[PDB]
Amino acid sequence: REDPQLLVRVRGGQLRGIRLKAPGGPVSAFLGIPFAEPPVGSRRFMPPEPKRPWSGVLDATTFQNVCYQYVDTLYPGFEGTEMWNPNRELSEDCLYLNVWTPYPRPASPTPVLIWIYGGGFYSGAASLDVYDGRFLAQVEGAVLVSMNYRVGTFGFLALPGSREAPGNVGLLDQRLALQWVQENIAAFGGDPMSVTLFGESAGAASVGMHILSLPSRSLFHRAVLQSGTPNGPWATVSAGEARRRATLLARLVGCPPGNDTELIACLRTRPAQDLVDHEWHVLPQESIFRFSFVPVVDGDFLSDTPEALINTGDFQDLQVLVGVVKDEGSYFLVYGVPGFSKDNESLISRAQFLAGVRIGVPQASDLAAEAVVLHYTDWLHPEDPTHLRDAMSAVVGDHNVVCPVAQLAGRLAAQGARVYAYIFEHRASTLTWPLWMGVPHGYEIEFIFGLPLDPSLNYTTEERIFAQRLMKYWTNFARTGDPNDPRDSKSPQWPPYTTAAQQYVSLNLKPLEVRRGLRAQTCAFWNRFLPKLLSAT
Amino acid sequence: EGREDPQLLVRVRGGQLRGIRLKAPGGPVSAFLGIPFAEPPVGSRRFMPPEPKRPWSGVLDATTFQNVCYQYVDTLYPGFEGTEMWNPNRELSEDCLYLNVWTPYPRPASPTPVLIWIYGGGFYSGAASLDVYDGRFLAQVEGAVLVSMNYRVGTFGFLALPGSREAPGNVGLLDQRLALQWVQENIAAFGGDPMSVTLFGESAGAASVGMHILSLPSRSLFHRAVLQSGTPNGPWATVSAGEARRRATLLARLVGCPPNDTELIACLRTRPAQDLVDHEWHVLPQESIFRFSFVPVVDGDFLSDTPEALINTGDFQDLQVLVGVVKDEGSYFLVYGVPGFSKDNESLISRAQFLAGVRIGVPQASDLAAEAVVLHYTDWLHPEDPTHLRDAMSAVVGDHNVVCPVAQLAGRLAAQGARVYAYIFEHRASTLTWPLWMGVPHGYEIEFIFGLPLDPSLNYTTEERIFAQRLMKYWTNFARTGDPNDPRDSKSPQWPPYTTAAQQYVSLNLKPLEVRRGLRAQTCAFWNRFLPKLLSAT
Ligand SMILES: Nc1ccc2c(c1)c(-c1ccccc1)[n+](CCCCCc1cn(CCNc3c4c(nc5ccccc35)CCCC4)nn1)c1cc(N)ccc21
Ligand SMILES: Nc1ccc2c(c1)c(-c1ccccc1)[n+](CCCCCc1cn(CCNc3c4c(nc5ccccc35)CCCC4)nn1)c1cc(N)ccc21
Ligand SMILES: *[C@@H]1O[C@H](CO[C@@H]2O[C@@H](C)[C@@H](O)[C@@H](O)[C@@H]2O)[C@@H](O[C@@H]2O[C@H](CO)[C@@H](O)[C@H](O)[C@H]2NC(C)=O)[C@H](O)[C@H]1NC(C)=O
């Protein structure tokens, strides 16, 4: 006997899902659905091709392979690093998606939530414990979709203008999963006419790039950008910079033994790990929060720079939820700034702070880095190691996340979008990173996905109530484009972010608190002053 | 003699003097007003260093104030007390090198600490005869010997053709140095202690005090110093030899003198004093506020290097300094040249009027530097709010010109061995006629330090009279000991020395002393550390 709730016919054929246990009851999971032809051999660096139909019933009960990527070995065996690392076999044959739906399958078309993972476009997988759609599906009755997209050289190595390596193919893999949803989600009880994209870090940048690319705009209705944006210093590169890095890596892998075709063909003959081995050696400077192969401003997927597109685009019929964590740049420091460690309090000297600023803002001139140091120094306690340590974290998170987010929020708002902004300030009771790291980058995700609801994970009762609140904000947003509950009449209400009032809310254990101005003075420094300083260079 | 008051007859190196017995609220004071300290700097002596006054015969009458040095008379708000109080109160003349002395009546039996006042007025104006500089209260109430002198201002005191013999520049500073030498020689005749001389001044007067700190020949003439809302460093207190040469040459052209220096200077000497005054303001390089045409020059003589170089490298080990600012240093300057500003309206300005004003307020700033200023002083929550824009314009002028040069000075002096005490004067006189938006303007602490509230006829409050008394004690305890704290009083909040480590200063208001940390620390790091690096690279 077969469970009819576990049998779905999609355009490509039949699938068999698995009944999964969530705290409050069962869910139907369809894991490892292929959405594209495996991008192997001659297909490496090429745009994805739709998956060909299959015979019989395809087993969709387990997560599929994780896209070929670099594996972090900074703190081996440490939960804090390991949780972000591949949890399935690495393979170039990784173009699969996952679907979680209520059990039984909803009777009416249900709003769809599509998750796009982060990991600096060099890493990530939709199989990670913190991306588990189980809770959202069970508790909120949502149809949750997550896909794997190619990362690193495989997803973003580009020789701009070539046919064989046009770049942005990882973004195309995501666009193909979005098309798959339009064509097949109704078979799972999902509403193709109510699709919300959500992502964190590189995932949030990806969401933004789908907002700014016209062929993606017909595939979703609302968007959520958690601690990431399409604009900013790390999310994109120029055609020139991508060409430079691709040519250098090819040179590094003894490739060619000339023409775009010749070079790409020889890169295709190379074992996956050979490309990963040299991936990090193509960065122009010693840096942090910089990734070798990221989306390219090609004049195709991205018709112009995200900055140009956000300044001139029409976002009238768009709803966006944007926000940041309390300590965006804290973890980045243990990956390359001398004096920083997870194992000590990381109390730094002034000299170490100045050195760290050159690493944190690698594009900055001597004058620009001096402007940064002078702005982030506490002139009452300018040598205080704690202030210097926290100022170093603030430099990295403001430059890379907070102020690009502030910039996106403002431009979207001014150009017709309905924007809701937040600051996530709750540190998980379960967190293993030091106290000095505060609420690091990515540690709100487990709360949005509702992991505290699993009693085995040992979160507090308040954290379980808080996770439930977040799941409601996110799904009310997916449902209506407003994170506020239409039933709840004693709130306080989450107001839209506007250029005039600059209103955002604090997300913590306490009830919603409304704040105005997202690091307004400091972001005027990054967004208004620093460009004028580098434009007169 | 024989029938005169024997307490009013004193001999100085120059000859005999007759003073006057004045009434102070608490009792009488001796006053010796209009004592000549130099040969009248007229004719061929115009632009020349002062010469010591030759001895006179008979009893020189020292019962009235003497002539005010030739200067521009402010006609912005005619008949208005707010402007008029700063204006000459005696006849204008180039024969103005006179000093005043106030002592207790009867004269002290033992050597008394001396306080020497140096007036402000952007080195273009001022007089030691102004009501707010009245030494009678300090003399009566604190038993102090108070001296104030006239020094040449404008072209007469500071027009220089650097390197020339006929117009070397800084002669107004030399007039001040000559009055300090006069005190060393003659103050003991009035009961004053030449071995305990404290200089005090406000605005250009405070800058003058600082220049005496930085000029070795003045250092032997005083022991302690008070710099109220002014410093030798900063954008307005000095000019380069090049800039002074440019302005003197242009002024000569504007009055009919065609440029060799001897010929030029000789011609300038043939010109009516009023003709120079009528063209004084036309030599400024840009439309500006808080900029004065003829100020001290970096000559490599009086000033061996720039005040900035001198404060960064000097040894101040055996020096005690009292420094401070008022709450609204730049507020009044805006009604003298920033469009949208008036004493008669609330001065609520637009963003465009703020951007325009920043260019007038920071005239030496490039487009990028002016942009850095605007971005720093804008409230990005309410960037178009007229009240914030108005107050930000005042803060730009006050911080650039006073607060941050003062902060720079306090830090450098402290790091280089000086004993520094810093303050913020936040009390607005109940009697003030300037609008409320101006807050505590530049120079409105003076009347409190001099103890004018003690005169009941001036209609100050009882709290203001108690407050004036507190200030007079801080200042005179500082003059006496180099510490503004009373050794008799105990908590009685202590005024701590300002240090690089703790950056401690006090609030001077009607409430008891409150200790604060950092003098506009973030903002002054912008002006003192960042902006120079922006103009050194662009
Ligand atoms: N082997 C080798 C050789 C040379 C270099 C490098 C590696 C690396 C490097 C890249 C990744 C991990 C470790 C090291 N960097 C890059 C260093 C910058 C930091 C990159 C980085 C590393 N990670 C970790 C990813 N995992 C996490 C993720 C998230 N949160 C987290 C919170 C805590 C800890 C880890 C988290 C949320 C989003 C998902 C990823 N995120 N960004 C270089 C920079 C140069 N200029 C030169 C040479 C190298
Ligand atoms: N006739 C004419 C022609 C051309 C110009 C000017 C005048 C003037 C000008 C100077 C003084 C008064 C009125 C106008 N400036 C303005 C520059 C300086 C004005 C700033 C100033 C004015 N005052 C008044 C002096 N008295 C005061 C003093 C103090 N506080 C005060 C508080 C309120 C009112 C007056 C105060 C502190 C102590 C000393 C003097 N002190 N500083 C120009 C700037 C240009 N760029 C170009 C041309 C001119
Ligand atoms: C904080 O730690 C860093 C890293 O040191 C490592 O982690 C420590 C907790 C401990 O296990 C050390 O032995 C490890 O080396 C310190 O910086 C390094 O210090 C070592 C000497 O101990 C030196 O050889 C390395 O070059 C340094 N590396 C870097 C990146 O700076 C740092 O000094 C520690 N800070 C404090 C406040 O103690």
Ligand SMILES: *[C@@H]1O[C@H](CO[C@@H]2O[C@@H](C)[C@@H](O)[C@@H](O)[C@@H]2O)[C@@H](O)[C@H](O)[C@H]1NC(C)=O
């Ligand atoms: C304030 O005043 C400025 C100067 O205008 C003059 O003074 C005012 C008080 C009137 O008497 C007027 O007739 C004079 O011309 C103006 O430039 C400025 O715009 C005014 N600001 C406001 C907010 O009213």
Ligand SMILES: *[C@@H]1O[C@H](CO)[C@@H](O)[C@H](O)[C@H]1NC(C)=O
């Ligand atoms: C939760 O706590 C219990 C009891 O201490 C422990 O046995 C269990 O392993 C913990 N679970 C996790 C996920 O750490």
Ligand SMILES: *[C@@H]1O[C@H](CO)[C@@H](O)[C@H](O)[C@H]1NC(C)=O
């Ligand atoms: C003091 O007050 C009286 C009474 O109102 C008034 O006539 C006099 O002119 C005032 N004097 C001053 C200096 O304000």
